[PDB]
Amino acid sequence: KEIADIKEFLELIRRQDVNSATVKINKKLNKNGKAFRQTKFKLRGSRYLYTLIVNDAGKAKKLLQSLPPTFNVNKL
Amino acid sequence: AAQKSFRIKQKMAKAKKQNRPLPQWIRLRTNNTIRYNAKRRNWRRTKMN
Amino acid sequence: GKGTPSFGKRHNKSHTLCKRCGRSSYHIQKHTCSSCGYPAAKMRSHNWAAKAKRRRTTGTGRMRYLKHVSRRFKNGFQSGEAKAQ
Amino acid sequence: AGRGAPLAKVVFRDPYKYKLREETFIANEGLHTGQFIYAGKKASLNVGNVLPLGSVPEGTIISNVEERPGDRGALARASGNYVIVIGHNPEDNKTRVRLPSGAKKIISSDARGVIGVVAGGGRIDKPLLKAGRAFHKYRVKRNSWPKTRGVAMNPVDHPHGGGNHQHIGKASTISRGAVSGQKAGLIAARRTGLLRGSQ
Amino acid sequence: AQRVTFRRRNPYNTKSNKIKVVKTPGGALRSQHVKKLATRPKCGDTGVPLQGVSTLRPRQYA
RNA sequence: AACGCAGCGAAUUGCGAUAUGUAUUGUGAAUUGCAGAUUUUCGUGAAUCAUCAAAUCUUUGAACGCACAUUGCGCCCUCUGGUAUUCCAGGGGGCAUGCCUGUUUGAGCGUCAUU
RNA sequence: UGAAGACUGAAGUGGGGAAAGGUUCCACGUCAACAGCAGUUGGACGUGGGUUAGUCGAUCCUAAGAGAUGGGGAAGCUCCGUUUCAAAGGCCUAAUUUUCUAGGCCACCAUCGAAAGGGAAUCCGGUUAAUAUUCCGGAACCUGGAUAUGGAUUCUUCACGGUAACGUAACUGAAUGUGGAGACGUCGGCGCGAGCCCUGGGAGGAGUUAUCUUUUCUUCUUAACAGCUUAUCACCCCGGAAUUGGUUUAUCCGGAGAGGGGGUCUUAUGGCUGGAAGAGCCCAGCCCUUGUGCUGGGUCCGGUGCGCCCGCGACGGCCCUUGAAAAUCCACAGGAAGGAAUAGUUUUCAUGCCAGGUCGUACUGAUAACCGCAGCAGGUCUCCAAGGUGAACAGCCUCUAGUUGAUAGAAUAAUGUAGAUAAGGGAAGUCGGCAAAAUAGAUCCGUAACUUCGGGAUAAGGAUUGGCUCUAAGGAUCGGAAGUGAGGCCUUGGUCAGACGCGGCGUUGUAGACGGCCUUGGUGGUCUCUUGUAGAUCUGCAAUUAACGAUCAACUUAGAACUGGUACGGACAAGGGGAAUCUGACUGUCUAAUUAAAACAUAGCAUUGCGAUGGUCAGAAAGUGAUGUUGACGCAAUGUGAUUUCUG
RNA sequence: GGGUGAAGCCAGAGGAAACUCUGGUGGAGGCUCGUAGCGGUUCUGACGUGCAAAUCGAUCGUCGAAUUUGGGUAUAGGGGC
RNA sequence: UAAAUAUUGGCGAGAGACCGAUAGCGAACAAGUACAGUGAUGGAAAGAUGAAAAGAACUUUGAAAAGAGAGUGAAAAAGU
Numbered sequence A: 001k002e003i004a005d006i007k008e009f010l011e012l013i014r015r016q017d018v019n020s021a022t023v024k025i026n027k028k029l030n031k032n033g034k035a036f037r038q039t040k041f042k043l044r045g046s047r048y049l050y051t052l053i054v055n056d057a058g059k060a061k062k063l064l065q066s067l068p069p070t071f072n073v074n075k076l
Numbered sequence B: 001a002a003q004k005s006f007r008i009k010q011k012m013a014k015a016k017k018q019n020r021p022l023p024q025w026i027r028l029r030t031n032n033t034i035r036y037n038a039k040r041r042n043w044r045r046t047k048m049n
Numbered sequence C: 001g002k003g004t005p006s007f008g009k010r011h012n013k014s015h016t017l018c019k020r021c022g023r024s025s026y027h028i029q030k031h032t033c034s035s036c037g038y039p040a041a042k043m044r045s046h047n048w049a050a051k052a053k054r055r056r057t058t059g060t061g062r063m064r065y066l067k068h069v070s071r072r073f074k075n076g077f078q079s080g081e082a083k084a085q
Numbered sequence D: 001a002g003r004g005a006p007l008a009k010v011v012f013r014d015p016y017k018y019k020l021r022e023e024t025f026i027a028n029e030g031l032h033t034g035q036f037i038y039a040g041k042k043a044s045l046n047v048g049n050v051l052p053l054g055s056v057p058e059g060t061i062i063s064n065v066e067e068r069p070g071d072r073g074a075l076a077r078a079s080g081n082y083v084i085v086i087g088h089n090p091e092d093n094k095t096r097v098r099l100p101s102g103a104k105k106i107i108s109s110d111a112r113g114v115i116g117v118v119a120g121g122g123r124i125d126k127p128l129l130k131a132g133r134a135f136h137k138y139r140v141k142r143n144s145w146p147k148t149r150g151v152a153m154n155p156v157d158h159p160h161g162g163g164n165h166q167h168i169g170k171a172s173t174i175s176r177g178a179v180s181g182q183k184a185g186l187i188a189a190r191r192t193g194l195l196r197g198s199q
Numbered sequence E: 001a002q003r004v005t006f007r008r009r010n011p012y013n014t015k016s017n018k019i020k021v022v023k024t025p026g027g028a029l030r031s032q033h034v035k036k037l038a039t040r041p042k043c044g045d046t047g048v049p050l051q052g053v054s055t056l057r058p059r060q061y062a
Numbered sequence F: 001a002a003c004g005c006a007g008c009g010a011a012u013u014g015c016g017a018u019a020u021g022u023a024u025u026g027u028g029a030a031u032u033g034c035a036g037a038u039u040u041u042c043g044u045g046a047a048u049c050a051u052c053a054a055a056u057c058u059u060u061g062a063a064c065g066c067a068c069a070u071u072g073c074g075c076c077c078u079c080u081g082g083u084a085u086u087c088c089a090g091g092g093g094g095c096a097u098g099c100c101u102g103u104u105u106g107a108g109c110g111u112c113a114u115u
Numbered sequence G: 001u002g003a004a005g006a007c008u009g010a011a012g013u014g015g016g017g018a019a020a021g022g023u024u025c026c027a028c029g030u031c032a033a034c035a036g037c038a039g040u041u042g043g044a045c046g047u048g049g050g051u052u053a054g055u056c057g058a059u060c061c062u063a064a065g066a067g068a069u070g071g072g073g074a075a076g077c078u079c080c081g082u083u084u085c086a087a088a089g090g091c092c093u094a095a096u097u098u099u100c101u102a103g104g105c106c107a108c109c110a111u112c113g114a115a116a117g118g119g120a121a122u123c124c125g126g127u128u129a130a131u132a133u134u135c136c137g138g139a140a141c142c143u144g145g146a147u148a149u150g151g152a153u154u155c156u157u158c159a160c161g162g163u164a165a166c167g168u169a170a171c172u173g174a175a176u177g178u179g180g181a182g183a184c185g186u187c188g189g190c191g192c193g194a195g196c197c198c199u200g201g202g203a204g205g206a207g208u209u210a211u212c213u214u215u216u217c218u219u220c221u222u223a224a225c226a227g228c229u230u231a232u233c234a235c236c237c238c239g240g241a242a243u244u245g246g247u248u249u250a251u252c253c254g255g256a257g258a259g260g261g262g263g264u265c266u267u268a269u270g271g272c273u274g275g276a277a278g279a280g281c282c283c284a285g286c287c288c289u290u291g292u293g294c295u296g297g298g299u300c301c302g303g304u305g306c307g308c309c310c311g312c313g314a315c316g317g318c319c320c321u322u323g324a325a326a327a328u329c330c331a332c333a334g335g336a337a338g339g340a341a342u343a344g345u346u347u348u349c350a351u352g353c354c355a356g357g358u359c360g361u362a363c364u365g366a367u368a369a370c371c372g373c374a375g376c377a378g379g380u381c382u383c384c385a386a387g388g389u390g391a392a393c394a395g396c397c398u399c400u401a402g403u404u405g406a407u408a409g410a411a412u413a414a415u416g417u418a419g420a421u422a423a424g425g426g427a428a429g430u431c432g433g434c435a436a437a438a439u440a441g442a443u444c445c446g447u448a449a450c451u452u453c454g455g456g457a458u459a460a461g462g463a464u465u466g467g468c469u470c471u472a473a474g475g476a477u478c479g480g481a482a483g484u485g486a487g488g489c490c491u492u493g494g495u496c497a498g499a500c501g502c503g504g505c506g507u508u509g510u511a512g513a514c515g516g517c518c519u520u521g522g523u524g525g526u527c528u529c530u531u532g533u534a535g536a537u538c539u540g541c542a543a544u545u546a547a548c549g550a551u552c553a554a555c556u557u558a559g560a561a562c563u564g565g566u567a568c569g570g571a572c573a574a575g576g577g578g579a580a581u582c583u584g585a586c587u588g589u590c591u592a593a594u595u596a597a598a599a600c601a602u603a604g605c606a607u608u609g610c611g612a613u614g615g616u617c618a619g620a621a622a623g624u625g626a627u628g629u630u631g632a633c634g635c636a637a638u639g640u641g642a643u644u645u646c647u648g
Numbered sequence H: 001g002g003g004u005g006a007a008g009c010c011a012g013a014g015g016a017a018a019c020u021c022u023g024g025u026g027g028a029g030g031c032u033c034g035u036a037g038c039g040g041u042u043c044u045g046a047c048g049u050g051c052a053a054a055u056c057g058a059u060c061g062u063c064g065a066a067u068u069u070g071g072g073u074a075u076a077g078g079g080g081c
Numbered sequence I: 001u002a003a004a005u006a007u008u009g010g011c012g013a014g015a016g017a018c019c020g021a022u023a024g025c026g027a028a029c030a031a032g033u034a035c036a037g038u039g040a041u042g043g044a045a046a047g048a049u050g051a052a053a054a055g056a057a058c059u060u061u062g063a064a065a066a067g068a069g070a071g072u073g074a075a076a077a078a079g080u
């Protein structure tokens, strides 16, 4: 698998070879500065499966809503 | 011997099927002098090739 | 240890199966059979062994062409078919 | 491998094509890598250069000499050996030549010869010591080594062999007019015993 | 502690049949058959290795 | 010579993916160890019958495209699929060597006539 | 099946393969024979079930070799020969746009031969009574076909950058020629990394507990593949070296340009992110006839080394030994031909589409699946390999894993077989010290004739070794006491976002913790006091060498005291020594199953034949062979048998 | 796994000089003690209608090369080696 | 260039002062078969219940095999 970037992620969705995209939640704790959430947006199709790391939960929620209604957002 | 040929495996395929005892309904046939199979093979006693 | 210890080392094959004669007597190092003489033109027959011919010569096999020749000769090698009365 | 002589590989051009042909020469003591070599009739007299015997003065030194013209080499190819030119003839193109054994020979004037002594000299001087050194010499040549003495053998296996004591029995000096099987010893000997000085 | 086995039948330790032992995500120690190393490209006139060119066995860089 | 084929067979006896046989002709009711039919039983017809003139004939072998301790690897014509003169697969037909008779292209100041 | 005792002891009674066997693997039924006792058990007997590949092999290339064809032999079965005294072909582009014809270049040549050599590309987790790198789930990669979107390139064009080593995501190139990879021995130490071993703190579970032990044991793991970083060796620019410098364990290098300062490159190997925590392992708790789940938790942070074993790297010894070939893929020289702007070139790059045949794949690999007439103390090619003792892959004792199989019971006569000990003497035995005894490890002392001065040599011959408590020496990392303006914690002032949770049927109401940036002062010794405490935990003006301080960490080598039934390499393991004579110099080799030697071989020495139309030798014959991919410092044929010394 | 310590290098001491001694470093050899491996000396031990048509035990030789061994290939009976 | 002449092989018919299952072909039977050897090759043993299987239903002892009775048949002194 490759990675992210951001951006390019937005241009990868414009292909529509990439149809679906699962999301994952992984609780981390950078030396207990903050015990933070993180999310992971993975994009299948075809040779590679790409993935973007986003740490802030706020930044993730704006991005999660902004994608098309027709796009199949899988979870876990 | 694991890495065997097709010509060898074809001979051993026969050796499986031929090695079996005499069917009972043949013994009730008319005239018939046969009782047990003479041509029989066990792997420990006798070898093939 | 010329006897039983040397017998323990025997696990090779000087001879394999043959195409023509169907017998485990095909020398690989020489590229020739001892029984029939494949691959040559002829069958390896010898007058000094009468039993050698008796085991393999005509009559032993199916004779799936030669078996019906005497029947064809007697009738006179016909063509066509019988009609009816 | 198994040759007392370091070889040399020289690149010549093809006069009739855009190509290169390598030829394997025996290196005379004096050559080096990144050196020019001049082969022909009009070529000059230096170490390495290949000349025909006619365009060479008397008392010169050469090696890899041809018996005929077009033989591609024959006389004097071994280590530390060299042919010396003695004489000349105008009528009949035939120079006089001395071979390294001692016996002289008349060779044609147009035959070739590479100038200089053959490299790797003084190979025979060191003794072999241990038998394993002798093994490795014959290991990269033939199967001619561990030679048993014929007198030690049985009378079946060799003529000299047999008897209660290890002796030959009859004269080891055997004739030229003999047959294969008999010839084991000194064949057609003029002299026998220890020779003094002059060969 | 944890012994290992061969994979591709060929039992004899020759070149093109050597093993680097590796820990798995399961936990067991298992073998993996290491490929042969590629020597560097070299100069024509001199016998010096050529700089600014990749290694790779002759077929990998097709 | 190998490998297969019977409703239930391992061998022997028969036959070749049309496989203990199909068509054709004759005889006129069986086969049979146990099943099972088919009703064909005043018939263009039972049968492990006799007969035998039409066909089928796996892979081989003098064995023939080149090989053959390999079910190895190619080339040509032709129809059908996948977008196809060239790539992939499928169905069909072909490609050995020596020698003879002829046919068509040719090679040689070997040699003849004509510009 | 349970419980208790045992052994093999990781060079194994462990886990997998090669040759060879061929269903012996696995389930259900069942004991007439076979398993030299027995049998309810079985590798037996009866009836079925079982081996799934583009990536692992075979297939393909060549090796020592084998072997058609053209030719020449032989009455002939066939023999020689493989590039030859042969007219020995198959590879690319158009023409023509019926798909058949035209361009061309180039040329001593079948075919078989390796399941350990060469070689296009796959890994983790799950699942079966018996199969898996081959099925299922998830993530990759190659070769051969097709092909269009984006990007790049183009007014003078087939890109620009850097002094240079070289760089960038891409960046026309035929005939022909040249170069690289494929492609290569061994012994030695030094360095780097993997895995295991060892060990500290925590987070769980099991063991022990009359008494003692912040402990005895175990779990805390991370694949191929994608991306960005990291190196000894080489190499480029600057500059000019004897008071010669730099430098390895190992002495090599420099006006053919060293040291010093600054760079470029191969990515072997590590690090971080993706893979990927959703998986696996380890606890705790719910139901549930079954099938099963379902629900919480945790999966963390380090240290050490002449350690063991494997790989990689730069170096150094060896040789009258210098340690395979071809298929196959790439690069450069070279300029053939072909191309634009109202548009065209590129498919050595980014994405995207289709396809991947044939055969092998079970199990055993041996004191019971192979060979030895057999379930025979025999024989038969390999890989992985823990703890303690110790020089040690020696012997002895454990852990993991695997067996507990080899007819049993009762008494203890002679004679046996295998092990043992013995008063005084010490080879008197016997053909003969045969057999058995004694010596043995380490450290220090001490060492003859003779000698080819290399050895003899562990010569001979003495002394010491335990346990416990101490002392001495041997290393690696990091730090200098004072003179302002500027960037940790706390506070002051400015400046900017804003986490989550809950309630009515995606919506609508709703509290709302906290984070960094910017910048002035204060913060071990000291005093105020009966006593202090927090962090010494960014530039200026410029003091110093042994006179030192902190912090962590190995195992070696010396010396001293005390102490015992004078014992201490306490078991295991481990040379008897000396003075001569005959003989072969030495290491080496042979009579497989009565002879291992003084026999054979050997280096060294000597003799004989040969200049290719030749010597020695094969063949029935050949337009045929071996030495010979040879040429007298060579090839062939014999004798003697190192050195010193002589050969009448 | 030990023992011995050859060339090649570095430093010192003695001497009027020619040179001569001493200490390290280094790791040579068909060297040497000994495990697996390969062999088969003695007990004229065990067994000798055997476990075995050549095995069993203890004691022994050699153990980095004239070494030990797998697969492929060559040489065939007055012939081969 | 037919005929009179040959013939231990092949296809089809006749006979015998010949052998009678250790004989006669090696082989009267699933014989060039089973089995041995790396290989050329080597190479056995084995015929007969009764006219008809009518091949022993049923009881009882035994874990079973079998045993005692019974029954079939001219005979089980014919029980595969």
Ligand SMILES: [Zn+2]
Residues within 6 Å of the ligand: C018, C019, C020, C021, C022, C023, C025, C026, C033, C034, C035, C036, C037, C038
């Ligand atoms: Zn044959």
